[PDB]
Amino acid sequence: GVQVETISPGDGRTFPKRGQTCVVHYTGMLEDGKKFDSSRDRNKPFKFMLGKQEVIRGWEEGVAQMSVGQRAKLTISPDYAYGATGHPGIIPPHATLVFDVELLKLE
Numbered sequence: 253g254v255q256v257e258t259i260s261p262g263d264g265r266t267f268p269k270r271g272q273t274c275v276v277h278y279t280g281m282l283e284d285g286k287k288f289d290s291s292r293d294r295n296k297p298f299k300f301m302l303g304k305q306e307v308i309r310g311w312e313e314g315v316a317q318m319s320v321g322q323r324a325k326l327t328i329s330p331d332y333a334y335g336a337t338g339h340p341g342i343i344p345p346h347a348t349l350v351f352d353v354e355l356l357k358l359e
């Protein structure tokens with residue numbers, strides 16, 4: 253599944269709801285912490301709408317448990333990420349992933 257570990261607290265009150273657009277900054281790492289992507293590197297917050305099947309399962313479930321302003325480390329098992337397929341050249345088959353995510357706002 254997904255483990256959610258707080259890096260910095262949010263407001264503890266305002267959580268994503270289906271149909272809202274989550275605006276986040278993230279860094280994606282392989283299991284050992286090696287970075288493969290970051291929205292921070294491109295100076296571009298990432299937006300996705302909850303309930304629209306736009307993201308891997310670990311994000312859909314993990315980000316929903318974050319409150320606005322929170323930073324969290326999401327450790328996502330392969331079944332909740334890219335599974336057996338992986339994503340050739342970026343994500344190995346059967347990879348556990350770690351994302352640092354900051355929930356900036358809901359739009």
Ligand SMILES: CC[C@H]1C(=O)C[C@H](O)[C@@H](C)[C@@H](/C(C)=C/[C@@H]2CC[C@@H](O)[C@H](OC)C2)OC(=O)[C@@H]2CCCCN2C(=O)C(=O)[C@]2(O)O[C@H]([C@@H](OC)C[C@@H](C)C[C@@]3(C)O[C@H]13)[C@@H](OC)C[C@H]2C
Pocket residue numbers: 278280288289298306307308311333334335339342343
């Ligand atoms: C069409 C191009 C469109 C896109 O990729 C949309 C797509 O849905 C994205 C949002 C989705 C993802 C790749 C789903 C798969 C669909 C196939 C299905 O089999 C898979 O199931 C297991 C899941 O991403 C995710 O769920 C997760 C969680 C949210 C953050 C991104 N995610 C990551 O894992 C990353 O960090 C990663 O580096 O992000 C980059 C990134 O581009 C720099 C994507 C956007 C920022 C840019 C966008 C919108 O422009 C693309 C990505 O590039 C191709 C490779 C991955 C490894």
